[PDB]
Curated annotation (Swiss-Prot), chain A:
Component of the 17S U2 SnRNP complex, a ribonucleoprotein complex that contains small nuclear RNA (snRNA) U2 and a number of specific proteins. Part of the SF3A subcomplex of the 17S U2 SnRNP complex which is composed of three subunits; SF3A3/SAP61, SF3A2/SAP62 and SF3A1/SAP114. SF3A associates with the splicing factor SF3B and a 12S RNA unit to form the mature 17S U2 small nuclear ribonucleoprotein complex (17S U2 snRNP). Identified in the spliceosome 'E' complex, a precursor of the spliceosome 'A' complex. Identified in the spliceosome 'A' and 'B' complexes. Component of the 17S U2 SnRNP complex of the spliceosome, a large ribonucleoprotein complex that removes introns from transcribed pre-mRNAs. The 17S U2 SnRNP complex (1) directly participates in early spliceosome assembly and (2) mediates recognition of the intron branch site during pre-mRNA splicing by promoting the selection of the pre-mRNA branch-site adenosine, the nucleophile for the first step of splicing. This is Splicing factor 3A subunit 2. The modification Phosphoserine is found at S39. It comes from Homo sapiens (Human). It is found in: Nucleus. Belongs to the SF3A2 family.
UniProtKB/Swiss-Prot annotation, chain B:
Belongs to the cyclophilin-type PPIase family. PPIase E subfamily. The RRM domain mediates both interaction with RNA and with KMT2A (via the third PHD-type zinc-finger), but has much higher affinity for the KMT2A PHD-type zinc-finger. Residues 2-79 form the RRM domain. Identified in the spliceosome C complex. Component of the XAB2 complex, a multimeric protein complex composed of XAB2, PRPF19, AQR, ZNF830, ISY1, and PPIE. Identified in a pentameric intron-binding (IB) complex composed of AQR, XAB2, ISY1, ZNF830 and PPIE that is incorporated into the spliceosome as a preassembled complex. The IB complex does not contain PRPF19. Interacts (via RNA-binding domain) with KMT2A (via the third PHD-type zinc-finger). Changing Y5A: Decreased affinity for RNA. Found in all the examined tissues including heart, brain, placenta, lung, liver, skeletal muscle, kidney and pancreas. This is Peptidyl-prolyl cis-trans isomerase E. It comes from Homo sapiens (Human). It is found in: Nucleus.
From Swiss-Prot, chain C:
This is Pre-mRNA-splicing factor SYF1. The gene is XAB2. It comes from Homo sapiens. It is found in: Nucleus. Transmembrane segments: none annotated. Belongs to the crooked-neck family.
Curated annotation (Swiss-Prot), chain D:
Ubiquitously expressed. It is found in: Nucleus; Nucleus speckle. The modification N6-acetyllysine is found at K9. This is Splicing factor 3A subunit 1. The chain holds residues 47 to 282 of 793 of the full protein.
Amino acid sequence: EVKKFVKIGRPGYKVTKQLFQIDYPEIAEGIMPRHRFMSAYEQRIEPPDRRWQYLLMAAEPYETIAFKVPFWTHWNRETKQFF
Amino acid sequence: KRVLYVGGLAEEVDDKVLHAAFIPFGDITDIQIPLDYETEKHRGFAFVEFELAEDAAAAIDNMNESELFGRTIRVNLAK
Amino acid sequence: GRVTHTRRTFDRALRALPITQHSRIWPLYLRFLRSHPLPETAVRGYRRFLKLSPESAEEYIEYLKSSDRLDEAAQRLATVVNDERFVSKAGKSNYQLWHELCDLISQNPDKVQSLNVDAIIR
Amino acid sequence: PEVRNIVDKTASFVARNGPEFEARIRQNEINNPKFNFLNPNDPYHAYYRHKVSEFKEGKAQEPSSAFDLDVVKLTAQFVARNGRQFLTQLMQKEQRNYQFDFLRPQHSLFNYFTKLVEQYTKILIPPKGLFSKLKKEAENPREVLDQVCYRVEWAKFQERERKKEEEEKEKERVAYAQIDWHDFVVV
């Protein structure tokens, strides 16, 4: 059900790298937006030559801030800033 | 967890360069970079072993999304 | 009081090529630049065309900017601005913005001919 | 901006008092083109109408080893006589020609040193036995029952807190098995 009601609004990610800090709208949900390193081989078209990993930090209302990479975080709900 | 895994070892990236630029956050005790024996160039992966977990955590946090001679490097936590 | 000790001492300390003898060779040029910019320009040019480092031109130009010879400082800056194998020599550290700062301190209210200033801005 | 400020004023009024205040303004000033944007007659109508909800929700802005154990106990007894973090009975004895590698903070024996120190502090404080006697413990079934129920109550609070943490971790597991792996993108 957590995905049977998985709404796809596709909102932009506002993330600052240089250690990454992303902002998102007010969700009002205790679930912390999670990051993870995953494979660059899956897709609906998948242009060739996918041989790097991708670190994606995604949550409920704000779309996943993903970036190719060529309790180690923080989630401020009173400011809504993720690090 | 006092290890920094430096992904992105550039063309002339040596353990001296890595532990020198990431030495200021804490005493780094060892360094080891996987160098392709058939290529003489590193595999884009190095390991700096400090004694301080605060040092290595601050290093992973401030040295991620890094750059050394025009190369977008990233420091992560070794397992 | 004689350049003999300076030259021979530098050569004997340079027998190995470690980070030793570096801040005795280059501050020797610093203290030699007094009342004689020729040995200063000599050490600066031969160093920028001598033993390899990205900090070589750094210390050279940072020592030359403090003297009455500053186009030589800009010459070592230009050695960096070409660099022939590393466009980014220092990562986050700046050479071009610092050159712009020196150009700003030159277009400071001294050269108000209003041509050199706009040239330095471009 | 006259028309913009007026539309934002109608929006703030609708946010505070409702669209019923909008209708009140409509019937009160249908004689004036100022309630024209509160009417379907002026072009600012829909803009100010959405601006009502905007200012209501806060999207717009309003207008402008026995021996080792004994030795560790002795070290704790000497650290109960320590006056500062540097000047105590262990500093010189660290380098005074005798073996003492238990002051090092990484060796697990530093935990026994610190626990001996914590007990030494809880026994060397004023009620620990220094210059006074506590008797609500030495003759007190009332205090005994109080403190025992209180330990059980802290245990119950910690049980509920661990259950909450486990439920949150379960939600995190179900959501980690439910994060999106197709519409990925780099910004």
